[PDB]
Amino acid sequence: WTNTSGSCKGRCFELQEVGPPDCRCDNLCKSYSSCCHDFDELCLKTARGWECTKDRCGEVRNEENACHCSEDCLSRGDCCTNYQVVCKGESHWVDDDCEEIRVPECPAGFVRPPLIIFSVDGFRASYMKKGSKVMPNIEKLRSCGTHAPYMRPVYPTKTFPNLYTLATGLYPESHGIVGNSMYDPVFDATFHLRGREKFNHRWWGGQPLWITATKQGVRAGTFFWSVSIPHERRILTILQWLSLPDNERPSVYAFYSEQPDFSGHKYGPFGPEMTNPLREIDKTVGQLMDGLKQLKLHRCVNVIFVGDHGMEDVTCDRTEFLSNYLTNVDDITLVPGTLGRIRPKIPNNLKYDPKAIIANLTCKKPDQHFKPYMKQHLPKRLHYANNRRIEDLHLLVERRWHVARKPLDCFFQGDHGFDNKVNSMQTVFVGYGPTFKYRTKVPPFENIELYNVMCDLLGLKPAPNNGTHGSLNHLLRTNTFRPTLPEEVSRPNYPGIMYLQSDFDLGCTCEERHLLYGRPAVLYRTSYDILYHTDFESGYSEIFLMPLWTSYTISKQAEVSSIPEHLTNCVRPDVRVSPGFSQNCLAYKNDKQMSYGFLFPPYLSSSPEAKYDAFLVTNMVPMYPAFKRVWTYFQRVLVKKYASERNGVNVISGPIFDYNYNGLRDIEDEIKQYVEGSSIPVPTHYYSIITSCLDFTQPADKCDGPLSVSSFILPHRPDNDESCNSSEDESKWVEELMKMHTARVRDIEHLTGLDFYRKTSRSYSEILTLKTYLHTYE
Ligand SMILES: *[C@@H]1O[C@H](CO)[C@@H](O[C@@H]2O[C@H](CO)[C@@H](O[C@@H]3O[C@H](CO[C@H]4O[C@H](CO)[C@@H](O)[C@H](O[C@H]5O[C@H](CO)[C@@H](O)[C@H](O)[C@@H]5O[C@H]5O[C@H](CO)[C@@H](O)[C@H](O)[C@@H]5O)[C@@H]4O)[C@@H](O)[C@H](O[C@H]4O[C@H](CO)[C@@H](O)[C@H](O)[C@@H]4O)[C@@H]3O)[C@H](O)[C@H]2NC(C)=O)[C@H](O)[C@H]1NC(C)=O
Ligand SMILES: O=C(NC[C@@H]1[C@H]2CN(C(=O)OCc3cc(C(F)(F)F)cc(C(F)(F)F)c3)C[C@@H]12)c1ccc2[nH]nnc2c1
Ligand SMILES: *[C@@H]1O[C@H](CO)[C@@H](O[C@@H]2O[C@H](CO)[C@@H](O)[C@H](O)[C@H]2NC(C)=O)[C@H](O)[C@H]1NC(C)=O
Ligand SMILES: *[C@@H]1O[C@H](CO)[C@@H](O[C@@H]2O[C@H](CO)[C@@H](O)[C@H](O)[C@H]2NC(C)=O)[C@H](O)[C@H]1NC(C)=O
Ligand SMILES: [Ca+2]
Ligand SMILES: [Ca+2]
Ligand SMILES: [Cl-]
Ligand SMILES: [K+]
Ligand code: NA
Numbered sequence: 001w002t003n004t005s006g007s008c009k010g011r012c013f014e015l016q017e018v019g020p021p022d023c024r025c026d027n028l029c030k031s032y033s034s035c036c037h038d039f040d041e042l043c044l045k046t047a048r049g050w051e052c053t054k055d056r057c058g059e060v061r062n063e064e065n066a067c068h069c070s071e072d073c074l075s076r077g078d079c080c081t082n083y084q085v086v087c088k089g090e091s092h093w094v095d096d097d098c099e100e101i102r103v104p105e106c107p108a109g110f111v112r113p114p115l116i117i118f119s120v121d122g123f124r125a126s127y128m129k130k131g132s133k134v135m136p137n138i139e140k141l142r143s144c145g146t147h148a149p150y151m152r153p154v155y156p157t158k159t160f161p162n163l164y165t166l167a168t169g170l171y172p173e174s175h176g177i178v179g180n181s182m183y184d185p186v187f188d189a190t191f192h193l194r195g196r197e198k199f200n201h202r203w204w205g206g207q208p209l210w211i212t213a214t215k216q217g218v219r220a221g222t223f224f225w226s227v228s229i230p231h232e233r234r235i236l237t238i239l240q241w242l243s244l245p246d247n248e249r250p251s252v253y254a255f256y257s258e259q260p261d262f263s264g265h266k267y268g269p270f271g272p273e274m275t276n277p278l279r280e281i282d283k284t285v286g287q288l289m290d291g292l293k294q295l296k297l298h299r300c301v302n303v304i305f306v307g308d309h310g311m312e313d314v315t316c317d318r319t320e321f322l323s324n325y326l327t328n329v330d331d332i333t334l335v336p337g338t339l340g341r342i343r344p345k346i347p348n349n350l351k352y353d354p355k356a357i358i359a360n361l362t363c364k365k366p367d368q369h370f371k372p373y374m375k376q377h378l379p380k381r382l383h384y385a386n387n388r389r390i391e392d393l394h395l396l397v398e399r400r401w402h403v404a405r406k407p408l409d410c411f412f413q414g415d416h417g418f419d420n421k422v423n424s425m426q427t428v429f430v431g432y433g434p435t436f437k438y439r440t441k442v443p444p445f446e447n448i449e450l451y452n453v454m455c456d457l458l459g460l461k462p463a464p465n466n467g468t469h470g471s472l473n474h475l476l477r478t479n480t481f482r483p484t485l486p487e488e489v490s491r492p493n494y495p496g497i498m499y500l501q502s503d504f505d506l507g508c509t510c511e512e513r514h515l516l517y518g519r520p521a522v523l524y525r526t527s528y529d530i531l532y533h534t535d536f537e538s539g540y541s542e543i544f545l546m547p548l549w550t551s552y553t554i555s556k557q558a559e560v561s562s563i564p565e566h567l568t569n570c571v572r573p574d575v576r577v578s579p580g581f582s583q584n585c586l587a588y589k590n591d592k593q594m595s596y597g598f599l600f601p602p603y604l605s606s607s608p609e610a611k612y613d614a615f616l617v618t619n620m621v622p623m624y625p626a627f628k629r630v631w632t633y634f635q636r637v638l639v640k641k642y643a644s645e646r647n648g649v650n651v652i653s654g655p656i657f658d659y660n661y662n663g664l665r666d667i668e669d670e671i672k673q674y675v676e677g678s679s680i681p682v683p684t685h686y687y688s689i690i691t692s693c694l695d696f697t698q699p700a701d702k703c704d705g706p707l708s709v710s711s712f713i714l715p716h717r718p719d720n721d722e723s724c725n726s727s728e729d730e731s732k733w734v735e736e737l738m739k740m741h742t743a744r745v746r747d748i749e750h751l752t753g754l755d756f757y758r759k760t761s762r763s764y765s766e767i768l769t770l771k772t773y774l775h776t777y778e
C-alpha cells in the first residue's frame with residue numbers, strides 16, 4: 001500500500017527512486033497508482049500554455065504558470081523555451097547557420113557531453129524527404145549532423161520489440177519482448193500493451209541503457225513517459241533536469257513521441273493529414289533546441305533523433321482470414337495483423353494439428369497475401385525463433401495486407417509489423433552534436449548497432465549484445481571503439497598425399513587467385529585440413545566430414561561447362577584425407593531421401609582435367625533432391641551471372657548446423673540428423689558469401705579499394721513448399737527464394753564459428769561495416 005497523503009512540494013519529477021509506503025512524484029507514479037494527492041496540481045501545471053508572449057516579459061513569478069517569463073526564470077531553469085527569443089531578442093536555434101562543433105562547448109560543471117535520445121514512433125524514413133518545408137528543426141539536425149538515408153528496425157516491426165532493441169542492442173528473441181502482445185507458456189501469462197502485467201520485471205531481459213548507466217555510476221533520466229504528460233511538459237522536464245546541481249544532473253535523457261505513428265495508423269503514410277503531426281514533432285524539436293540554446297548547451301549535447309519503425313498503407317479491405325483456409329478457427333488463438341502467430345486457444349490443448357494447419361495455409365490461393373513458416377524455417381536474418389514466447393507457427397504477411405482469424409474480428413489506413421527489410425518499415429537516424437561527424441551521410445545500418453554507440457557516447461562498457469562494436473565508428477568524430485581481431489583457436493593441418501586409392505572402401509565409383517581476403521579463422525577447438533586445388537581452396541573438417549568453407553574466384557568472362565554423362569555419379573577418394581575421416585557413397589545409395597551436392601561446382605572448372613577435382617569426396621555435401629534444384633541453379637547459372645555483372649566474384653560457400661535455431665554454430669551433441677546409416681551430419685542451411693570490388697571497373701582479383709558483398713543462408717529443406725511457383729523452371733523462382741534468404745556476413749560468422757576478411761588492405765572498422773551489410777533487394 002502507498003500513502004498518497006504525502007506531498008510533491010519541491011519534489012516534482014524527482015529522480016530519487018522511492019518505494020512504498022512513501023508516495024511518488026515521478027513520471028511512473030500514475031501507472032503504479034502511487035502519486036501523492038497533489039501531483040497533478042503541483043507537477044502538471046498548464047496555466048497560460050507553453051510559450052512566452054510579449055505581455056509576459058519581466059512578469060512577477062506566478063507559481064501556477066506552466067512555464068515562466070520572469071527575470072529569475074533563467075537562474076531557476078524553468079523559462080518557457082522561447083523566453084530569450086520573445087523577451088531578450090535572441091534568434092530561434094533553427095534560424096542560426098550551423099557551425100561545426102569541433103569540440104564540446106559546455107558550461108561550467110559539464111565534464112562530458114550529455115546524451116538526449118529523441119524517439120519518434122512510426123517515423124518512416126521517407127518522411128525526411130518532406131524537408132525544411134514541413135520540418136525545419138529536424139532538417140537542420142539531419143543536414144548539419146550525421147544521418148543515414150534510413151535505419152533498419154528489427155522484426156516484428158512493432159513498437160515495444162523495437163524500442164527495447166534500441167535500448168539493449170539485442171534481438172527480440174534475446175531480450176524477450178517478441179511482440180506488442182505475447183504469451184509465455186512457463187508463466188502461463190499474457191503480456192499486453194494496455195495492462196499492468198507489462199510492468200512485471202520478468203518480461204524484460206538483457207540490460208537496457210538506463211541500467212547499464214546506473215550500474216556504472218552514470219545517472220539517467222526517465223525512459224518511460226506517461227501518456228497524460230504532454231510533450232511540452234516532457235521537454236520542460238528534460239531542460240529542468242539539465243539545470244540540476246552537478247551532483248544530481250543525469251547524463252542520459254530520453255524523449256518520446258507517439259506521433260507520427262498515431263496519425264499514420266489513421267490516415268496512412270502518404271495522406272495529406274500527415275503534414276500536421278510532422279509539423280508538431282518539429283515544433284517539439286524546436287522547443288528542445290531553443291531550450292538547450294537558452295542553457296548554453298546547444299553545442300554541448302549529443303542529440304540522437306531516432307524512430308522505432310516505419311508505416312505502410314494497410315486498410316480493412318486488405319485482410320486475409322484463416323477461416324477461408326481452415327475448417328475450425330475457434331480452437332486457435334491468432335496474434336493478428338501485419339504478422340501472424342498461431343497457438344491453441346487452450347494452452348496445452350492436444351486437438352491442435354500444426355502439420356494439417358500449415359498444409360491448409362500453403363499456396364492455397366494463387367495470389368495468397370501471407371506465407372506460413374515453422375519458426376525454424378523463417379529467414380535467418382530475422383533472428384526470430386529462439387524464445388519460448390515465439391509460437392512454432394508463424395505467418396509472414398505481404399506488405400499492405402493483414403491476416404485475421406475470421407470476418408467477425410475504414411477507421412485505419414496505416415500499419416506496420418512486416419518483414420524488417422520491407423522499404424515502408426525503414427525508419428530514421430540522425431546524430432547531432434560534438435561527438436557525431438559534421439554534415440556526414442552514412443550508409444543504412446541496423447538499430448541493434450546503436451546501443452554500443454550510446455555506451456561509447458556515455459563512457460560506458462556495453463553489456464553483451466548483438467551489435468558489432470566498431471561497425472559504426474564511421475558515424476563518430478571521437479569516442480570510436482578500437483576493435484580487437486578475434487584470436488584464431490584451431491590451427492589447420494596442411495596434408496600431402498598420404499594414402500593409396502586402394503586404401504579406400506567407400507562404395508564410390510568414377511591461394512593467390514582463390515583466397516583473396518585471407519584464410520577464415522576457426523574460432524572454436526576442432527580438427528581441420530587446408531586443401532588446395534587448381535580452381536578452389538577448402539577448410540575440410542575431419543569432425544563433420546565436410547568443408548567448413550570452400551573458397552574460389554570466378555572471372556567476369558569465365559566459361560560454364562557441363563558434367564559429362566559418364567561423370568554423373570563420379571565421386572573420387574581424396575588421397576590427402578584418411579578413409580576414416582571421409583564420407584562414403586554407400587550411404588547416398590542407401591538413403592532414398594538424401595542425395596549429394598558439391599561446394600565447388602564442376603560447371604565452373606577451368607579445364608576438363610581440373611573438373612575431376614570437383615568430384616572429390618572432400619568437396620561433397622548432403623543435399624535433398626528438392627534442395628539440389630535450388631543449389632544446381634545457383635551453381636550453374638547465378639554464380640556466372642554475378643561474375644559477369646560484378647566483373648568477377650570471389651565465392652565462399654559451406655554448411656551450417658543450427659538444429660536448436662539459436663543463430664549459433666551447433667556443437668556435435670546438437671546435430672539431430674545424419675545421412676542414413678552413417679555419421680555424415682546433415683546441414684540445416686547452406687551459405688554463400690559473394691565478394692567483388694565496390695569499384696566494378698576493377699576485377700574482383702585485383703581490387704585496390706572497398707569491397708562489395710552479397711550473402712545468403714539457404715534453408716536445406718526436403719521440399720520447395722516455401723516457393724509457390726516451384727513446379728515451374730528454376731529461372732522463375734530460385735532467385736526469388738535466395739533474395740528472401742539474404743544474409744549479413746556477420747550472421748554466417750555466428751552460425752559457423754568462422755571469422756572472415758582477416759587479410760585485406762582495408763581498416764578493421766571498415767571490414768566490420770562490410771560484415772554487418774545486408775543486401776535487401778528493396
Ligand atoms: C545476441 O547477443 C546475446 C547477448 O550476448 C546472445 O545471448 C546470450 O547467449 C549466451 C550463449 O547462449 C547465453 O549464455 C548462457 O547464459 C546462461 C545463464 O543465463 C542467465 O544469465 C544471463 C546473464 O545475467 C542472462 O542474460 C540470461 O538471460 C536470459 O534468460 C532470462 C530468463 O529467462 C531472460 O529474461 C532473458 O531474455 C534471456 O533469455 C534469452 O537467452 C536464453 C538463454 O540464456 C534463451 O533460453 C531465451 O530464449 C532468450 O533468447 C539468463 O538469465 C548460462 O547458464 C549458460 O551457460 C553455458 O556455459 C556453461 C559453461 O560455462 C555450460 O555448462 C552450459 O551448458 C551453457 O552452455 C550460458 O552462459 C546468454 O544468456 C544469452 N544472453 C541473452 C541476454 O540472451 C545471443 O546469442 C546473440 N545472438 C546471436 C545470434 O549472436
Ligand atoms: O503503447 C503504445 N505506446 C505507449 C508508449 C509508452 C511510453 N513509452 C516511451 O516513453 O518510450 C520511450 C522509450 C525509448 C527508448 C529508446 F531506446 F529508444 F530510447 C526505449 C524504450 C524502452 F522500450 F526500452 F523502454 C522506451 C513507450 C510506450 C503504442 C504505440 C504505437 C503503437 N502502434 N501499434 N501499437 C502501439 C502501441
Ligand atoms: C502518511 O503520510 C502523512 C503525511 O506525510 C503522515 O501524516 C503525518 O503523521 C504524523 C504522525 O505520525 C504527524 O505528526 C504529521 O503532522 C502528519 N503529517 C501531516 C502533513 O499532517 C502519515 O503519518 C503517513 N502514514 C500513514 C500510515 O498514513
Ligand atoms: C483443409 O481444407 C479442406 C478443404 O480443402 C478441409 O476439408 C473439408 O472439411 C469439411 C469439414 O467442414 C468437409 O465437409 C469437407 O468434405 C472437407 N473437404 C475435403 C476435400 O476433404 C479441411 O478440414 C481443412 N483442414 C483444416 C485442418 O482446417
Ligand atoms: Ca476458401
Ligand atoms: Ca545452434
Ligand atoms: Cl505483436
Ligand atoms: K540417394
Ligand atoms: Na512448391
Ligand SMILES: [Zn+2]
Pocket residue numbers: 121122158159160261308309
Ligand atoms: Zn512504434
Ligand SMILES: [Zn+2]
Pocket residue numbers: 122159261262265416
Ligand atoms: Zn503503430
